[PDB]
Amino acid sequence: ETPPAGMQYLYGSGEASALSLQAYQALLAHVAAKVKVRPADSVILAEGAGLDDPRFVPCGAKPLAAVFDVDETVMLNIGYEYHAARTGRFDTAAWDAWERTGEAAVAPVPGADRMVRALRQMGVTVVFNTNRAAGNAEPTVRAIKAAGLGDAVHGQTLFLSGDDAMGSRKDGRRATIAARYCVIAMGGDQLGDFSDLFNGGPSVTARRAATMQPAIAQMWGNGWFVLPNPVYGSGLKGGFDEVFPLDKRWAAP
Amino acid sequence: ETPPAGMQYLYGSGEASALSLQAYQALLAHVAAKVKVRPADSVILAEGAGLDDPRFVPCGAKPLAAVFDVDETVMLNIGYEYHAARTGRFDTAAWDAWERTGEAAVAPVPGADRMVRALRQMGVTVVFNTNRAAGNAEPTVRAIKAAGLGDAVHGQTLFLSGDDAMGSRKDGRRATIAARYCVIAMGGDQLGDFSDLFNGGPSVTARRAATMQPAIAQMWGNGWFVLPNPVYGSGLKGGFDEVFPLDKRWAAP
Ligand SMILES: [Mg+2]
Ligand SMILES: [Mg+2]
């Protein structure tokens, strides 16, 4: 009669709350310095830049902005994950219904409503880039509002799956955002919220090593801001040999 | 044939690696400012200060230090958790054996070995406060060393369960550390690594609310630094009514 451990941690624990408040505290102080001293590089990778040699879209004189994934980055999908725990169901038809009717069972990630208000008081535009469907743009706007995250506008501050022909790949939308804003901070909970190059090929152990590539490792808490998600997605993969390296194994007596 | 989801995330994913590098990046920049401008308050709560009215031990002119929990804060216990996933076993006799023989199956939390080296290059003493047993101080010293975390000394930079008569409660050891150092940063993965007042009474929902108390919320990423642990401990508690609030519930059609 107890929910899955990952949901206990993410939705129930003070540990996960404190972890989330830490990320937004670091984001806010990073944005503050970039508002006082505008950078030369934005936080979005340039097209053609690989994970083995990263390079970024220039900041120029474009208006300052911050980009956020929606689900489990700024908004907790409590209603849907409650259904998953009750049912045991990955059901795409249930999630499509959730995208349309879930606006009254969402909550802000701890500190996300304060963080969004402070960014707008600093003159920084808040842009959402999410893989919710374009056809559900309006209920998504209402759910973001009910979570205390402000007013999103499709095509200006809200970009959805199907706005282009790239599907779940977010690089296209990131390039569109970077072409009109100078993004000084980007938040996410899965690595695809920072670059599609983490996905569509690399193995579980390769993706983990890629985060420690020196030009990439410098971004974490310093441009790229991460929130916890041990409940679903690209972080919950791999067999025994990819989770526990063979030189670090041990047996009880 | 796949490990538990929480271990997939924590030990296998790039998401958890990036989350950990973000915490240490924020810690390093926080310590840098406190070395340039010594604060008046240390980061350890004073005795008698409650979570409803926090107050801290003064910094004074004491040497600067940073305090870390060991397990899943700076050191990953890969060997033991591999055994848990293989077995399904919470076995105190197996963990006691792990405390004595696990020095060759540990790894640093991503960024922890670099973070520890940088702190010592800045002149900041690295102090470990862990609930491993006092009688296992020497194999614990060797495991910390094999994880690339430097040289710990029992009673000077390493404080263990049983060093006083308080058991798993860490407040006593924190007061001893704060009496001789000015702790400018403290890292942990469970709330008991910051104050015993989060435990020994408060419910799952109360502990989560306590992290958002205003004087407490300001500490996260700004003195108190958190690392992820969805595998075991005080973050994996609660029934359905404590994980999913009743005003945020939803049912698929
Ligand atoms: Mg997400
Ligand atoms: Mg720990």
Side-chain angles (χ1 to χ4, degrees), chain A residues 2-35 38-54 56-88 91-120 122-155 157-168 170-217 219-253, chain B residues 2-35 38-54 56-88 91-120 122-155 157-168 170-217 219-253:
Chain A
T2 75
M7 307 186 182
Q8 275 182 329
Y9 178 82
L10 179 55
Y11 304 111
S13 77
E15 285 76 6
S17 179
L19 201 59
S20 308
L21 294 163
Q22 162 177 271
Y24 288 133
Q25 169 71 38
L27 187 151
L28 284 174
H30 186 87
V31 169
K34 298 314 170 195
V35 172
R38 168 183 288 262
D41 277 354
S42 83
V43 93
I44 289 183
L45 290 169
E47 289 182 19
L51 292 182
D52 56 7
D53 193 6
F56 298 89
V57 174
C59 176
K62 316 193 212 75
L64 304 186
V67 169
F68 297 91
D69 172 60
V70 171
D71 301 314
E72 275 61 51
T73 292
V74 293
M75 190 173 74
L76 299 168
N77 289 274
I78 295 172
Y80 185 84
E81 301 301 333
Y82 167 77
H83 152 81
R86 287 292 194 203
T87 305
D91 187 11
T92 56
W95 177 262
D96 179 71
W98 168 255
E99 281 196 9
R100 290 182 277 106
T101 65
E103 63 192 67
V106 291
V109 164
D113 46 359
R114 299 182 178 275
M115 176 274 306
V116 138
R117 287 188 248 111
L119 288 189
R120 302 203 179 99
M122 302 181 57
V124 178
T125 299
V126 176
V127 178
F128 302 105
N129 184 17
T130 169
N131 273 339
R132 288 163 169 259
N136 300 325
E138 186 54 44
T140 293
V141 165
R142 297 197 296 270
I144 291 171
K145 179 65 168 181
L149 304 171
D151 302 325
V153 180
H154 191 193
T157 55
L158 174 60
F159 300 86
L160 300 129
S161 178
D163 282 353
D164 61 15
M166 316 300 293
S168 65
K170 281 185 179 175
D171 280 13
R173 281 163 279 165
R174 272 188 287 267
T176 300
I177 298 167
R180 69 180 74 166
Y181 299 103
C182 165
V183 181
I184 49 179
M186 192 152 57
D189 65 289
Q190 304 179 60
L191 292 182
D193 303 333
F194 308 102
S195 173
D196 291 340
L197 299 175
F198 290 112
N199 297 319
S203 70
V204 167
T205 65
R207 298 171 80 256
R208 185 163 169 109
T211 69
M212 275 168 276
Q213 215 264 353
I216 297 294
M219 302 296 296
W220 307 122
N222 191 31
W224 288 355
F225 299 91
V226 192
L227 290 115
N229 180 12
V231 176
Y232 67 91
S234 49
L236 284 73
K237 302 286 183 181
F240 266 83
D241 291 5
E242 298 200 280
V243 177
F244 308 104
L246 293 237
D247 64 328
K248 307 291 188 186
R249 289 183 177 189
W250 178 87
Chain B
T2 75
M7 307 186 182
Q8 275 182 329
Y9 178 82
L10 179 55
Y11 304 111
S13 77
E15 285 76 6
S17 179
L19 201 59
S20 308
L21 294 163
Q22 162 177 271
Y24 288 133
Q25 169 71 38
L27 187 151
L28 284 174
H30 186 87
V31 169
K34 298 314 170 195
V35 172
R38 168 183 288 262
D41 277 354
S42 83
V43 93
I44 289 183
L45 290 169
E47 289 182 19
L51 292 182
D52 56 7
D53 193 6
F56 298 89
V57 174
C59 176
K62 316 193 212 75
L64 304 186
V67 169
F68 297 91
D69 172 60
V70 171
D71 301 314
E72 275 61 51
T73 292
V74 293
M75 190 173 74
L76 299 168
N77 289 274
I78 295 172
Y80 185 84
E81 301 301 333
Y82 167 77
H83 152 81
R86 287 292 194 203
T87 305
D91 187 11
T92 56
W95 177 262
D96 179 71
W98 168 255
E99 281 196 9
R100 290 182 277 106
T101 65
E103 63 192 67
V106 291
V109 164
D113 46 359
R114 299 182 178 275
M115 176 274 306
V116 138
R117 287 188 248 111
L119 288 189
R120 302 203 179 99
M122 302 181 57
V124 178
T125 299
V126 176
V127 178
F128 302 105
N129 184 17
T130 169
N131 273 339
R132 288 163 169 259
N136 300 325
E138 186 54 44
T140 293
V141 165
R142 297 197 296 270
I144 291 171
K145 179 65 168 181
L149 304 171
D151 302 325
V153 180
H154 191 193
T157 55
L158 174 60
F159 300 86
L160 300 129
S161 178
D163 282 353
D164 61 15
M166 316 300 293
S168 65
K170 281 185 179 175
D171 280 13
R173 281 163 279 165
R174 272 188 287 267
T176 300
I177 298 167
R180 69 180 74 166
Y181 299 103
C182 165
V183 181
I184 49 179
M186 192 152 57
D189 65 289
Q190 304 179 60
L191 292 182
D193 303 333
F194 308 102
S195 173
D196 291 340
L197 299 175
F198 290 112
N199 297 319
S203 70
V204 167
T205 65
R207 298 171 80 256
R208 185 163 169 109
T211 69
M212 275 168 276
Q213 215 264 353
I216 297 294
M219 302 296 296
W220 307 122
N222 191 31
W224 288 355
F225 299 91
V226 192
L227 290 115
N229 180 12
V231 176
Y232 67 91
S234 49
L236 284 73
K237 302 286 183 181
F240 266 83
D241 291 5
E242 298 200 280
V243 177
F244 308 104
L246 293 237
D247 64 328
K248 307 291 188 186
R249 289 183 177 189
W250 178 87

